[PDB]
Design a protein around this ligand. Structure first.
Ligand SMILES: [Zn+2]
Ligand SMILES: [Zn+2]
Ligand SMILES: [Zn+2]
Lengths: 49, 54, 44, 100, 189, 146, 469, 212, 162
């Protein structure tokens, strides 16, 4: 985008962080997957020091 | 400085040139007034609205 | 008319097609930085 | 010449008929997410072309960031004109709207 | 061009009024998740109070009018509770019909009003084993939450509804194995 | 109980076995004819919701209500096809949907004015959109104006 | 688009209408008359389709404004059609009114009283007065009664509009919503159905011969049937106080009908009140001239190295030849003395005239809507007319207005990266160096932009150019 | 075996009373809830067959109605005894309506109104006339779960609605003049109905439609 | 392990500006010739759905076929204006061919001011047609208007201020 009005809109209205919940049902669309889930189960285990 | 700006941008350049609309040479000008875009204000006040281009 | 038009269209079609056959097309750039392309076909 | 005067009087009259006076305002006292973005962009545009700035830059070079700063201190001299669907409108100053 | 207007109604671009209020309740779907998550809001009360900052709005909101009207209607709606829907009292329209949810604290959907009051009613326990949060204060905060979950004037709800039906329907391109018409064919019918 | 086929009046005679006040249908147009537009509206909402519920897809009734209110805006059962579209006040929007020269021919013969309110029309003429950030005007407060 | 070139004037609405041959002639930069486009040295033929009055072409300067191929916006010219043609876009509507006409009393064959009832309703709908248009139908208290009925309906419409204007409900510009537009469209449909549904004229009682068409815009007139010729001469005393039919005959018939039935037509052809006060004319359905669009919209193409003529020019030159040819038929036609002109020569002259009209009408059709043109030299495949240009594939509107190819963008295969933020995008330098942004220079950023300009086009973060004041 | 037929007539009668009450006229609650037996008692001969002519009745506006709708006239309901409706019977009915000065006539026919007689419907302004078939009154559609409560607005209520939303009449959502509920409430063009919906989202929710 | 051949013309592309198409003045299709990337109908709807009217304006106007063009405020056309051709020393002005009289015809019907006459390149003199300004339109609008006038159809743009 090529002018500050369009900048402001892309950073405040259509920006990724503005779109955590979907408008379909109002639920999350962004999260971590694969390695990151497996990693979490391990890092947050009681056995972890 | 809106009055200053209207003067330096538009009016001053008209001085001592022929102008097609008044059908003569413009010698000069008096009593410049901005029309407030807020139609509810008094012709008095020195705070006025000017609509900005999209 | 229609019968005369046949002959007249033929010789004009031939004439016009040959004229264009050795035409020379000159580049036109905008202030933008933009060549203007002579093509009649948005083939997208 | 006589009738341009008339034309102007009609324009100005209908404009006044459309304006909803301050104390009869009825829309949300909150700044909308749309109003915010445009206010920022537009004020940023004016900053980029040497509008007098009402806040300390403190090294900032992004005019959008300067606007944001101005917004934060409520020093943006802009007014939002909200249109109801019949074309009548309410003027709300940026400073008076609750921002979030 | 169907969008939310500054009067909370939903209009087409030519001014034609399509709905009088977005969900019958003016709520943004993407601000809705925690509106009836009361126990999550009661823990976390203090952070929510910081976030919503009631101090900055006292001068700009009517804090009495809608609450008073709300009680008037809760009475009539209960006094005529068990009688069938066509013999219903219509002396009193819902609060949202009369008071702008953005301006009047307490102007709130009746579902929400009920869900909230039921919670407060059935959970007096949590208002002692709380951090000093009393029943009154929590109602107010939840009411303020509703206010801050409103759809914004300007939203292209029409485009969004279209996408919320078209996009998810791509998951119905195939099928499993009454006897009725299903999936996309039906959606077309 | 569930019937293949629709005939409300016939069912109205079986008052002895069924609660006639709670009979519902698949068929939006049948309901419209017998019970009216509000009933038909509800039937549309439920039917569209039934479509998604079967595939465990969740879609807010807020969208569904709007779609159904739209469809019933003329007191009737209007589809999102040529006929429903044909009513729209915007000739530029119709021109950009289906059959440009037809809608254009219609506009000319009506000596129509495009008021430029639809998103389509404004894109055609290069006008800032009416929705969102285009739904209001911005004005500058300037001092020293007398 | 440049934030330092603001625009003060703003377009607020668009009005649809029809170009008159008078306007066109006045605005035209050149009348085009030569089918031939170039000469042996590749220069524009004067009076031809690349005539320099229509705009700069190749290395030549525009003869109208003097600007070159870059700053010259182009200018329109016109072709003079030697004989009126039906405008193919409107031929169906023309057909409706023609059929509906009474070729004797020159009203529509629908009874005047009914036609007036439609005029009343449509007029009310210009002001959005839907309830009133139904109330209009509620009005009743043989030719003496009818004029009082007409009169009292008329005074109702006036009273309703007056009342509607005094309170909020309308302006002199009308009121136009979807529900209004729906009621309007129904009425016009109902009106047209009723127009064509009449045989004998309800007003003078005569029968007019029936009109039949082509898909190629030709009109035939079927002469009168036996019972009907009998019926017609019985009414002979009261009035006392197949074949191709030329477009000129058709125009004369409609010209008169449009004068007589002007009242109703004034509302059938205007969805809003007609403040302009212009009459509704039959000419609107005909073309006496064709607008030749500016040269920049009709340029040749290069398919690699070979150069191909513009297809719209190929169609226009066919209009041009037929045009010259008819101007010759018209020349020999005047050199006939009627003292040698037979009764049999009457048939042959007509034969030649029908021929001319048909083929000019075909050449016009071919240029505007190739569908309505007779398939050429069985093969070749038709050359697109204007309709087909606007409607090619998804069509101009969808392919170049609702969606566009744009400047300042890039495309690439995507690759995963866990090391950027969830709200970032990792941009390859190959893009970063070619995509620019126009930053205005100020006190607060002069340091930064100095460095960018020093860095140049190829060292990031740099700059590719400077815009001066 | 006319036991059904009588029951169906008893049922259609109930709907008519309910309809007339809903329109604003004074009808007792006990009158609506007339038990099946009492109905035969009052309206059948000693023969078991039902006498339609005895069923016909007059209705006057109530207290609230007179205040809200000053020009609400009196209403007359007719149950034609004849399987088909002659133009003879129609006239007799219409005369009755005009002579004794009623604002509304409701004609409850059994199955056939000759289109000859349908002509006489708008014959006596300012008064208005409505027709209903019996078999379509066996059930009260407004009692249905899917049919929200429609309330007719007064001219004052309508003026206020249009002002509050700055609306032109035709920008409102439409309800067809011949919509089953419109016909039930006797809606004239231009009248606005307030509709109290149950929302899945909100509780009660007021919407409106204009009759065109 | 097997290495799979490329089946696809993968290669990336970027365009700031570059060649435009003659009729629409919109970016040509290309890659190998600096073509633009398409924002089509689906992306239009997305941009409306966000409420981002400036992003929409940036893509479908500003960064595509944005054009400052002359209109006649009087007849509402964008096709009948041209630059005047002035005598040497005088400055060129913007005039409407529809709204002005051929000089002869105007004489043939009070004195006529000097500022009211203009000339073209051929040499014909005109009286009037000086009510012009500039408006910002997508170029493709000019093409559409042009095609429509071929079909005998007139678009009339109402411009403000008058
Ligand atoms: Zn030129
Ligand atoms: Zn006649
Ligand atoms: Zn002009």
């Amino acid at each position: 985008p090529q002018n500050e009005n369009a900048r402001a809109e892309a950073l405040n209205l259509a920006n990724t962080d503005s779109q955590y919940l979907t408008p379909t049902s109002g639920s999350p669309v962004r999260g971590l997957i694969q390695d990151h889930i497996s990693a979490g189960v391990w890092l947050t285990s009681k056995d972890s020091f | 400085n809106p009055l200053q700006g209207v003067m330096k941008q538009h009016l001053n350049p008209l001085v001592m040139k022929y102008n097609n609309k008044v059908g003569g040479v413009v010698l000069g000008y008096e009593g410049l007034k901005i029309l407030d875009a807020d139609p509810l204000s008094k012709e008095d006040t020195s705070e006025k609205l000017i609509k900005i281009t999209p | 008319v229609s019968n005369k038009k046949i002959v007249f269209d033929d010789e004009v079609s031939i004439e016009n097609k040959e004229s264009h056959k050795e035409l020379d097309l000159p580049e036109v750039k905008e202030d933008n930085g933009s060549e203007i392309v002579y093509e009649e076909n948005t083939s997208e | 010449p006589e009738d341009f005067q008339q034309h102007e009087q009609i324009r100005r009259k209908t404009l006044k008929e459309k304006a909803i006076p301050k104390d009869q305002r009825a829309t949300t006292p909150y700044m909308t997410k749309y109003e915010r973005a445009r206010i920022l962009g537009t004020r940023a545009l004016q900053i980029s072309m040497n509008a007098p700035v009402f806040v300390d830059l403190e090294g900032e070079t992004d005019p959008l960031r300067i606007a944001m700063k101005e917004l934060a201190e409520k020093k943006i001299p802009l007014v939002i004109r909200r249109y109801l669907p019949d074309g009548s409108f309410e003027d709300w100053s940026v400073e008076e709207l609750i921002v979030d | 061009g169907v969008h939310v207007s500054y009067d909370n109604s939903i209009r087409d671009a030519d001014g034609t009024l399509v709905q009088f209020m977005y969900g019958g309740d003016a709520i943004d779907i993407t601000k809705e998740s925690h509106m009836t998550q009361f126990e999550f809001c009661l823990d976390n009360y203090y952070a929510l109070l910081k976030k919503y900052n009631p101090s900055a709005l006292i001068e700009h909101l009517d804090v009495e009018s809608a609450l008073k009207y709300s009680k008037k209607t809760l009475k009539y709606r209960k006094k005529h509770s068990k009688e069938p829907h066509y013999k219903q009292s219509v002396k009193y329209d819902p609060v949202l019909a009369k008071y702008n949810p953005a301006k009047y604290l307490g102007s709130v959907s009746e579902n929400f009003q009920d869900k909230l009051e039921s919670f407060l009613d059935k959970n007096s326990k949590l208002f002692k084993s709380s951090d000093g949060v009393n029943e009154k204060k929590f109602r107010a905060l939840m009411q303020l939450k509703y206010m801050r979950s409103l759809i914004n004037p300007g939203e292209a709800v029409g485009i969004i509804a279209s996408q919320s039906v078209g996009e998810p329907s791509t998951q119905m391109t195939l099928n499993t194995f009454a006897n009725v018409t299903l999936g996309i064919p039906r959606l077309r019918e | 109980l569930v019937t293949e086929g629709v005939n409300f009046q016939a069912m109205w005679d079986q008052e002895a076995f069924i609660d006639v006040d709670g009979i519902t249908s698949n068929d939006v147009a049948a309901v419209l004819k017998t019970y009216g537009v509000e009933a038909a509206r509800n039937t549309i909402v439920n039917e569209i919701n039934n479509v998604f519920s079967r595939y465990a897809i969740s879609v807010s009734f807020r969208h569904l209500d709007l779609i159904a209110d739209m469809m019933t805006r003329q007191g009737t059962y209007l589809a999102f096809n040529r006929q429903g579209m044909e009513t729209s006040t915007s000739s530029f929007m119709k021109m950009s949907y289906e059959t440009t020269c037809q809608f254009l021919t219609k506009a000319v013969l009506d000596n129509e004015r495009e008021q430029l309110d639809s998103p389509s029309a404004r894109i055609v003429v290069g006008k800032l959109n009416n929705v969102g950030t285009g739904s209001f005007d911005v004005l500058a407060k300037v001092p020293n104006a007398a | 688009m440049d934030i330092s070139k603001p625009v003060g004037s703003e377009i607020t609405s668009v009005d649809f209408g029809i170009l008159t041959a008078k306007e066109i002639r006045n605005l035209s930069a050149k009348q085009i008359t030569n089918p031939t486009v170039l000469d042996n040295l590749g220069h524009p033929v004067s009076g031809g389709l690349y005539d320099l009055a229509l705009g700069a072409f190749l290395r030549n300067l525009c003869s109208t404004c003097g600007l070159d191929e870059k700053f010259c916006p182009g200018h329109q010219g016109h072709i003079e059609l030697p004989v009126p043609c039906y405008n193919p876009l409107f031929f169906n509507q023309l057909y409706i009114y023609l059929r509906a006409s009474c070729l004797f009393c020159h009203h529509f064959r629908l009874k005047s009283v009914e036609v007036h009832r439609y005029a009343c309703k449509l007029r009310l709908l210009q002001y959005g007065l839907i309830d009133e248009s139904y109330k209009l139908d509620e009005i009743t208290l043989s030719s003496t009664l009818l004029n009082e009925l007409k009169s009292k309906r008329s005074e109702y419409v006036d009273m309703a509009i007056a009342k509607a204007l005094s309170d909020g409900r309308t302006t002199e510009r009308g009121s136009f919503t979807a529900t209004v537009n729906d009621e309007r469209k129904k009425l016009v449909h109902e009106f047209h159905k009723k127009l064509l549904s009449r045989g004998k004229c309800d007003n003078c009682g005569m029968f007019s011969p029936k009109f039949r068409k082509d898909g190629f815009t030709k009109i035939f007139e079927t002469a009168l049937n036996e019972k009907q010729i009998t019926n017609n001469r019985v009414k002979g005393f009261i009035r006392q106080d197949s074949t191709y039919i030329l477009s000129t005959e058709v125009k004369n018939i409609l010209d008169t009908v449009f004068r007589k039935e002007q009242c109703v037509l004034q509302y059938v052809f205007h969805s809003r009140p007609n403040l302009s006060r212009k009459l509704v004319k039959a000419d609107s359905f005909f073309m006496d001239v064709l607008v030749v669009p500016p040269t920049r919209f009709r340029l040749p193409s290069k398919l690699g190295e070979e150069v191909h003529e513009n297809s719209q020019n190929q169609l226009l030159s066919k209009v041009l030849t037929t045009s010259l040819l008819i101007r010759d038929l018209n020349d020999d036609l005047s050199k006939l003395q009627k003292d040698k002109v037979s009764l049999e020569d009457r048939r042959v002259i007509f034969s030649r005239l029908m021929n001319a009209f048909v083929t000019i009408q075909n050449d016009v059709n071919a240029f505007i809507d190739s569908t309505k043109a007779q398939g050429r030299t069985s093969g070749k495949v038709p050359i697109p007319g204007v309709k087909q240009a606007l409607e090619k594939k998804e069509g101009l509107f969808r392919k170049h207005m609702m969606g566009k190819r744009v400047n300042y963008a890039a495309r690439s295969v995507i690759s995963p990266d866990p090391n950027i933020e969830t709200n970032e995008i990792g941009v390859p330098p190959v893009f970063a160096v070619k995509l620019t942004y126009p930053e205005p220079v100020t006190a607060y950023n002069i340091a930064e932009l100095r460095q960018a300009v020093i860095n140049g086009p190829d060292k990031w973060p740099g700059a590719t150019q400077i815009q001066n004041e | 075996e006319n036991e059904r037929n009588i029951s169906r007539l008893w049922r259609a009668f109930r709907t008519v009373k309910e309809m007339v009450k809903d329109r604003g006229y004074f009808i007792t609650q006990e009158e609506v809830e007339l038990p099946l037996e009492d109905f035969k008692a009052k309206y059948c001969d000693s023969m078991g067959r039902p006498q339609r002519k005895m069923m016909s009745f007059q209705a006057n506006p109530t207290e609230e109605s007179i205040s809200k709708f000053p020009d609400m006239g009196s209403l007359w309901v007719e149950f034609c005894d004849e399987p088909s409706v002659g133009v003879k019977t129609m006239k007799t009915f219409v005369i009755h309506i005009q002579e004794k000065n009623f604002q509304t006539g409701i004609f409850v026919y059994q199955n056939n109104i000759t289109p000859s007689a349908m002509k006489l419907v708008p014959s006596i302004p300012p008064a208005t006339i409505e027709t209903f078939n019996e078999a379509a009154l066996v059930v009260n559609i407004t009692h249905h779960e899917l049919v929200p409560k429609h309330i007719r607005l007064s001219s004052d209520e309508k003026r206020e609605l249009l002002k509050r939303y700055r609306l032109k009449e035709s920008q409102l959502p439409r309800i067809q003049r011949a919509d089953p509920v419109a016909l039930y409430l006797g809606l004239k063009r231009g009248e606005v109905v307030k509709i109290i919906r149950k929302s899945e989202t909100s509780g009660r929710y007021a919407s409106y439609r204009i009759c065109m | 392990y097997q290495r799979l051949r490329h089946m696809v013309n993968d290669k990336f592309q970027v365009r700031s500006t570059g060649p435009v198409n003659s009729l629409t003045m919109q970016p040509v299709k290309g890659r190998k010739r600096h073509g633009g990337i398409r924002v089509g109908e689906m992306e239009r709807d997305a941009l409306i759905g966000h409420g981002t009217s400036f992003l929409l304006q940036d893509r479908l106007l500003n960064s595509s076929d944005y054009t400052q063009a002359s209109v006649c405020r009087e007849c509402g056309s964008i096709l009948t204006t041209q630059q005047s051709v002035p005598r040497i020393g005088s400055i060129s002005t913007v005039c409407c061919r529809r709204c002005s009289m051929r000089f002869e015809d105007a004489k043939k019907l009070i004195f006529i001011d000097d500022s009211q006459i203009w000339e073209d390149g051929q040499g014909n003199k005109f009286v009037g047609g000086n009510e012009t300004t500039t408006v910002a339109i997508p170029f493709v609008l000019k093409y559409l208007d042009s095609e429509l006038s071929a079909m005998g159809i007139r678009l009339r743009y109402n411009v403000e201020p008058k």
